[PDB]
């Protein structure tokens, strides 16, 4: 029976889409809170859960990756730092911004990635790709007006500006992580999961130390973050978030193996709309002319670019 499901096409895409939604909803649940401040601690727990999960699977012979080598970690530390900066600014941006606004704002990353490659990696941008970049700038502008239509005090606007600062920094940190990691993967030759294994190995020590220096580790503050009554729910949300990162990685390699890479690029772009709607259903998000049309213009822009890369790779 397991063989029948293994080769299925529809199942491979359903598992990936549900694991992507699971990651966003649980991450947003813990992050939002009201008194949550320990962002570094949360990221450290998610990384520890990832290392324990893959360590469990490899023991049972469901996933194969390399064996840690000290000489192989000194050449991967720079990418560990770039991962720390990317995830942290992603938690801050998601903490202050809604899930829909965050998702479309994340499309600004591929503008920096695509134009990052032309300067150094010798790539090019076709007319379809350029037409997309304009639509994702338009979606960004509309969404900014969507949030700004509900702020009427000195506060509730400085919160927006903090959300945009952490979002813009995360855009430049995600572009840097993708480009640099691409440059170094030629040197290291990691293939399927060892890239995730080292990422979540070095990320753990860095996050733990950064939590000690930056976050407030006191008796009072810890009580605010994790009230005794709501400990069980918060802990279960953190565990599901960490194990959802492994679930998406295993279901992504699963999707590519069955339905090729052509369908996986379109599945990632199409899945953005379910991720955005999950914010409206699960959390209180503003609904109006600007915000609703921002989801569909930012969705159309992502779809057009995905078709643009599909055309470029064809020839």
């Amino acid at each position: 029976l397991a063989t029948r499901i293994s080769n299925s096409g529809p199942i491979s895409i359903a598992a990936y889409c549900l694991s992507s939604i699971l990651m966003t909803v649980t991450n947003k649940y813990v992050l939002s809170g009201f008194s949550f401040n320990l962002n570094f601690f949360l990221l450290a727990v998610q990384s520890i859960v990832c290392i324990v999960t893959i360590g469990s699977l490899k023991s049972l012979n469901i996933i194969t990756y390399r064996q840690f080598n000290k000489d192989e970690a000194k050449k991967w530390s720079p990418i560990a730092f770039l991962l720390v900066a990317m995830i942290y600014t992603s938690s801050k941006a998601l903490q202050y911004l809604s899930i829909p606004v965050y998702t479309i704002f994340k499309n600004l990353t591929i503008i920096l990635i695509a134009y990052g490659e032309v300067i150094w990696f010798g790539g090019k941008v076709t007319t379809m790709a350029l037409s997309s970049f304009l639509l994702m700038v338009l979606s960004s502008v509309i969404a900014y007006y969507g949030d700004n239509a509900a702020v009427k005090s000195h506060d509730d606007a400085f919160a927006l500006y903090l959300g945009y600062f952490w979002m813009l920094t995360n855009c430049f940190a995600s572009a840097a992580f993708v480009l640099i990691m691409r440059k170094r993967i030629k040197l290291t030759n990691f293939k399927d999961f060892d890239t995730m294994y080292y990422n979540n190995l070095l990320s753990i020590p860095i996050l733990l130390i950064c939590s000690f220096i930056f976050e407030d580790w006191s008796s009072a503050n810890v009580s605010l973050n994790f009230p005794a009554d709501n400990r069980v729910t918060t802990i279960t949300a953190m565990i599901l978030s960490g194990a959802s990162s492994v679930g998406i990685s295993y279901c992504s390699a699963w999707c590519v193996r069955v339905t090729s890479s052509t369908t996986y690029s379109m599945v990632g772009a199409l899945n953005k709309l379910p991720i955005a709607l999950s914010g409206l259903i699960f959390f209180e998000a503003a609904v109006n002319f600007w915000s609703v049309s921002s989801i569909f213009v930012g969705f159309g822009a992502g779809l057009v670019y995905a078709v643009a890369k599909q055309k470029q790779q064809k020839e």
């Epitope: 939002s32 008194s35 509900a150 605010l224 709501n230 209180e284 998000a285 503003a286």
Partner: nanobody, 126 residues
Framework: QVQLVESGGGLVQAGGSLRLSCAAS????????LGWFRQAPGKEREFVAA????????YYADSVKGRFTISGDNAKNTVYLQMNSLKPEDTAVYFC????????????????????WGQGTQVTVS
């Protein structure tokens, strides 16, 4: 540190009126639902009222409909809970709980989605 602080509790004769507040020592109540619970001396926590900050939609408990009035002043990030015609049974510690999840997944009367809580204030009615 972000904490919710209540004020206005005290002792009031039966049939009187009172007002309680729930301020914030940090971020704003935008995109949150604020609820008011009560813990009688020897019973469990009970829902009293709730309000959605942005859309100002209020959900009221069964036994406090037509007596209480939860309202929100957007100019100071404070949530009020007027109490009228208090019966002696209202004696309890009133807590304020912030929340982010939506009412679709869990009802407004369920405590688990409430991820923050204030210390609370003793309200006594004789």
């Amino acid at each position: 540190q972000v904490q919710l602080v209540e004020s206005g509790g005290g002792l009031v004769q039966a049939g009187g009126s009172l007002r309680l507040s729930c301020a914030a020592s940090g971020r704003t109540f935008r995109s949150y639902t604020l609820g008011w619970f009560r813990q009688a001396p020897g019973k469990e926590r009970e829902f009293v009222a709730a309000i959605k900050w942005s859309t100002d939609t209020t959900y009221y408990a069964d036994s406090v409909k037509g007596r209480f009035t939860i309202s929100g002043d957007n100019a100071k990030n404070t949530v009020y809970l007027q109490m009228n015609s208090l019966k002696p049974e209202d004696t309890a510690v009133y807590f304020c709980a912030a929340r982010s999840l939506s009412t679709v997944i869990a009802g407004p009367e369920i405590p688990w989605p409430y991820n923050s809580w204030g210390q609370g204030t003793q309200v006594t009615v004789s």
